[PDB]
């Protein structure tokens, strides 16, 4: 089948980005790359039994 819908059907939800962040106490003058929580609005298939050791 299609590789997107196989992953969609199998194994059954938030996302995480690696972005700059500026912490608060108010706002600090620096930023740092960290894993931030994303908000709401933020191919081929190989055939087996070929490399099988028999």
């Amino acid at each position: 089948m299609d590789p997107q819908t196989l992953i969609t059907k199998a194994n059954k939800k938030e996302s995480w980005r690696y972005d700059w962040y500026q912490p608060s106490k108010e706002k600090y003058p620096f930023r740092y790359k960290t894993w931030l929580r994303n908000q709401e609005d933020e191919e081929d298939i190989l055939d087996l039994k070929e490399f099988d050791r028999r």
Binding site: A10, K13, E43, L46, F51, R53
Partner: protein, 395 residues
């Protein structure tokens, strides 16, 4: 969880061991050995796509892992996806209803390396829980799996003899001291290139067949005969002399010197003796017979704490006129190899060169068959911390 839903991936720089599901009777050999490679197709506007084969001679062959190091994490993650979607297609074509029982919850156990970046491991932690949507994940160290397939000794040393490199990792108190992890760029290709210097008339295929020959051993019957005949890959008989007893000595001396310079830095003597008493030698080259015994003999020649013979003979000549033993306080007094598990029927027949993969199946029976969720990231933990929850479930 369901033991038929367990997926274990052991990647290397050349190949990758893949197995989905346990036999539930005994631990067996992995049947899938996929070469670690990807095809990058240069699409216009700058987009990148990755395929399993050469798409109309427009793709370049990229190896994601070389010398144990990832050079393209986007290639490695899509190679894991290329394995996983193919396993989903195989289960959907064989069982036709596996998405409710065998594919409804797959706990993935990915085996990682010591030289991989923590940022790359966090990209893997992002990718498995976003793109692959896999609910449970263990990033297992291979060095700790090599001693978890053993009788689970507390203090040991792991020697991973690869093809182009050799890794030396000490393990103290079931923990990996990253400050003493060493890696030489000398592997099975060192044994090959030494045979290039010993016999320049042969070529790559004949020297590789000599390395893969059963009559290739290192002394520490084949020994009483001077010349023996082996077979080439194409079926040609080739005679060989004493050179099959040589070719490994430079690699054995380099591994012995690096293990000595690694393990002489441990200050605690009671924790340092059990590392020297529990030398574990793993790797794909280590299926060559006599290599482990020759490395143990070189360690007993170089780093064994023993009274010198030129002084012991003078002590005995002064005593011949009971002999007391000189008691040292230096820690490598006993250098022995760890006891290999000789109760696995399939792994005794197929050899113990891939015992790190057996350690993954044993720690999977430890963790994935128990409701303790403190060594794998769940969806509740990924929704709270995400990749920052990666280092809260480590060993």
């Amino acid at each position: 969880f369901r033991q038929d839903s367990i997926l274990i991936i052991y990647p290397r720089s050349q190949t990758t061991l893949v197995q989905f599901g346990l036999n539930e009777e005994t631990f067996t050999v992995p049947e899938l050995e996929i070469p670690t490679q990807i095809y990058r197709t240069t699409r216009q506007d700058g987009s990148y796509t990755y395929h399993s084969t050469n798409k109309d001679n427009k793709a370049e062959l990229i190896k994601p892992i070389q010398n144990g190091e990832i050079i393209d994490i986007s290639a490695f993650t899509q190679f894991l996806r290329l394995i996983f979607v193919s396993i989903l297609s195989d289960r959907a074509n064989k069982n036709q209803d596996a998405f409710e029982a065998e594919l409804s919850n797959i706990p993935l156990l990915l085996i990682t390396h010591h030289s991989w970046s923590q940022s790359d491991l966090e990209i893997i932690t992002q990718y498995v829980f976003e793109s692959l949507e896999i609910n449970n994940l263990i990033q297992l160290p291979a060095s700790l799996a090599a001693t978890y397939s053993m009788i689970s000794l507390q203090n040991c040393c792991i020697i991973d003899v690869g093809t182009h490199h050799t890794d030396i990792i000490p393990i103290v108190d079931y923990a990996q001291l990253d400050h003493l992890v060493s890696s030489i760029p000398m592997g099975g290709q060192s044994i090959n290139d030494s045979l290039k210097k010993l016999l320049p008339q042969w070529d790559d295929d004949q020297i590789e067949s000599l390395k893969k020959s059963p009559i290739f051993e290192v002394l520490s019957k084949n020994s009483d005969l001077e010349f023996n005949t082996f077979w080439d890959e194409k079926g040609n008989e080739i005679k060989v002399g004493k050179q099959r007893f040589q070719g490994c000595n430079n690699l054995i001396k380099n591994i012995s010197n690096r293990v000595g310079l690694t393990l002489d830095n441990i200050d605690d003597i009671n924790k340092a003796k059990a590392v020297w008493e529990n030398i574990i030698i793993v790797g794909g080259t280590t299926s060559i017979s006599g290599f482990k015994e020759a490395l143990l003999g070189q360690l007993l020649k170089d780093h064994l704490i023993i009274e010198p013979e030129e002084e012991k003979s003078k002590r005995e000549e002064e005593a011949k006129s009971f002999v007391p033993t000189i008691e040292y306080v230096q820690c490598p007094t006993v250098i022995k190899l760890a006891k290999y598990p000789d109760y696995f029927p399939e792994w005794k027949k197929s050899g113990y060169s891939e015992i790190i993969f057996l350690g993954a199946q044993i720690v999977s029976k430890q963790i994935f068959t128990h409701p303790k969720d403190t060594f794998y990231i769940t969806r509740e933990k990924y929704n709270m911390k995400g990749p920052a929850a990666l280092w809260d479930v480590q060993f």
